[PDB]
Amino acid sequence: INHNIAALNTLNRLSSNNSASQKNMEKLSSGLRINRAGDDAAGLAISEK
Amino acid sequence: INHNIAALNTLNRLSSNNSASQKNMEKLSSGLRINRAGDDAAGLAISEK
Amino acid sequence: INHNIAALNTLNRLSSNNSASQKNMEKLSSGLRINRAGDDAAGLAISEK
Amino acid sequence: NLTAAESRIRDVDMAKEMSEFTKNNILSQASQAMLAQANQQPQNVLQLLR
Amino acid sequence: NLTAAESRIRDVDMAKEMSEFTKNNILSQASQAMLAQANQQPQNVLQLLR
Amino acid sequence: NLTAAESRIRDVDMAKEMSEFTKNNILSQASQAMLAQANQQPQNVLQLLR
Amino acid sequence: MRGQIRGLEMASKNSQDGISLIQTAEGALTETHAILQRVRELVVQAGNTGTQDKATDLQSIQDEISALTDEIDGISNRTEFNGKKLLDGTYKVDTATPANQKNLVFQIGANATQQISVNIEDMGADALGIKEADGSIAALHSVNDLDVTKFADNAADCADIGFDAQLKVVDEAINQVSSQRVKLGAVQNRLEHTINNLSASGE
Amino acid sequence: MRGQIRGLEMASKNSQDGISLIQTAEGALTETHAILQRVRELVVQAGNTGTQDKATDLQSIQDEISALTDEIDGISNRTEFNGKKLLDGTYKVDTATPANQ
Amino acid sequence: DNAADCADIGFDAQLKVVDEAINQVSSQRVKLGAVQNRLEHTINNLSASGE
Amino acid sequence: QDKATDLQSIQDEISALTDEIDGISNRTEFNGKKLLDGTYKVDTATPANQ
């Protein structure tokens, strides 16, 4: 009951929320939801044209 | 909501009114509505004859 | 009680008031309530005649 | 007469439209303040957690 | 018109994205508190041992 | 005509360039705020430690 | 839920972009309209000059007008919203076969059938017509604007040359573009009411 | 007890969702209402133009209005709360047979 | 080429079948959630029985 | 509204995503065992082969 914390999803939720927050600031600092192409390739290609 | 001012028509209205005012003075200083041929080519050709 | 801000109408009110203000300036800079045809198609067609 | 009617179609009442503008910009600042208040509750949810 | 559509592709709604940010940072603190609670049980396993 | 074309090459639209300036300075303050938020997480890592 | 919500947001986005399209179109129609007003001026002047000034002044007037018509078709060709022709006959109201109308279906809502289509039609030949234009009249009144030397021949008598005829068909072309602009203004209203319904729904 | 309690909680949940439905419906009716106000404006103008402007201006007015009506039925059709038609005749007040309401 | 007309290309058709695929995976997830419930009730019955 | 090439981009994305669908149905394993593929289909022609 101790040798492995059962709260392991909680860790990946922590990583998820941290990475999320990072990407949020990336958008907030840039002023672009499409700042990196991984965001939305479709809207990217559109915005290119 | 910030990375691009929505007030963009306002700029072209500014350019429009400035250019307008310029042409106005052009007429006011010359005393000719037909000062440049771009004004009225028809009335120009008439005034030529 | 936290994972989604309940204040979501407030956002669309923000977009609404901003877009409104934009259109207001559009009129104020142009001197035309009928500047774009989306304003009033009826009064537009009239003003055309 | 015609140009007068034209004007009554097209002519902005800058007074009215600036009262309206002043209003609407203030509604923007208003609702923005409402977000600035709205987002302050989840931190007190953290206070519930700890 | 084109730049408007560009904006509607690219333009962040800083309001939305800051509500989202505030949220997510708080979820970080949240889950961190959840670890801070989670790790407190094995000591009571020691209390079972002694 | 020539000086007009010169101007259309060289002439700043101070209106456009000040909207752009105001924007960019605000983006500086923006991203600075983003750092001011970013650096606040490791302290909650300390809270995980203790 | 999340299906309808995400597609709703994309539907409002879609809507604002459709608005932008029709704003581009109607701006092209604003300048179209401006030219047609100018043509009307030139026809009024032409009507006086038909018995005041000579065939050569009229020739100058039609150099101007025909150039302006060339600019009409130039607008109907060059005007594009992200590359797409807006004004030409490609989105005509009613072909012989309704299947070939190719109508401007836009996405409006988040589910099936939640779509609206429209039509656009402008070119040089925007003069009178029953389904298409016609020959000496109803097309060339806009494409040619006949008064080269032809209002030196008569007042309004010919009814196909005649000044009354030319002018009334110019005014009708103004009415064609008018009604089209009126359509797109209504369309914009429809999409605004739409995005309101969408935003509230999404809430 | 626990039966009534759990079903009660689900009943309040059910209630808030019913609220959300009628809020969607009434928002559609807010824009409906907005259009009808606009129609009224166009009728007022139409009434003056009946002896001031011509049949073609009226034709323009009715291009607008008829388009707006097309938007009325468009609202009554497109407006849905989780896919469900809200405004159309499917939930009419009183059919000939009350069973079909 | 069309709006929804073809009924096999058509946008109404494409979209409704996408939504049905969502319903397929949906119902499957629903199954496995129920399965999990069944095994939880199971392990309860087991634990009590074993006592 | 947009052209065949933008649609081509959209389907580059979508078809890639479908490739990821089958990629999930193939890669997803619980201690090596395929879970999502047709190996555990609902109803074959012969129920014995389910």
Residue numbers in the entry:
A (entry chain L), B (entry chain K), C (entry chain A): 3 to 51
D (entry chain A), E (entry chain L), F (entry chain B): 255 to 304
G (entry chain V): 52 to 254
H (entry chain f): 52 to 152
I (entry chain r): 204 to 254
J (entry chain r): 103 to 152
What did the published study say regarding this structure?
There are three parts to the flagellar structure: the trans-membrane basal body that functions as the motor, the connecting rod and hook, and the flagellar filament that acts like a helical propeller. Our current understanding of supercoiling in bacterial flagellar filaments, referred to as polymorphic switching, is based upon the notion that protofilaments within the flagellar filament can exist in two discrete states, that differ slightly in length. The “short” state results from a protofilament having a right-handed inclination (the R-state), while the “long” state results from a protofilament having a left-handed inclination (the L-state). To reconstruct filaments at high resolution, all protofilaments must be “locked” into the same state, either L- or R-type, producing straightened filaments that lead to non-motile bacteria.
We also included a previously identified straight filament mutant, HagA233V, in the study. While the three L-type mutants (E115G, S285P, and S17P) have a left-handed 11-start helix, the four R-type mutants (N226Y, A233V, H84R and A39VN133H) have a right-handed 11-start helix, and the designations L and R correspond to the hand of these 11-start helices. The L-type 11-start helices are tilted left by ~ 1.7° and the R-type 11-start helices are tilted right by ~ 3.9°. Another example is the R-type mutant A233V in B. subtilis. A233 is conserved among Gram-positive species but not in Gram-negative species. In the A233V mutant, valine in subunit S0 makes stronger contacts than an alanine residue with the hydrophobic pockets formed by A43, L46 and A47 in subunit S+11, and A233V filaments adopt a right-handed form.
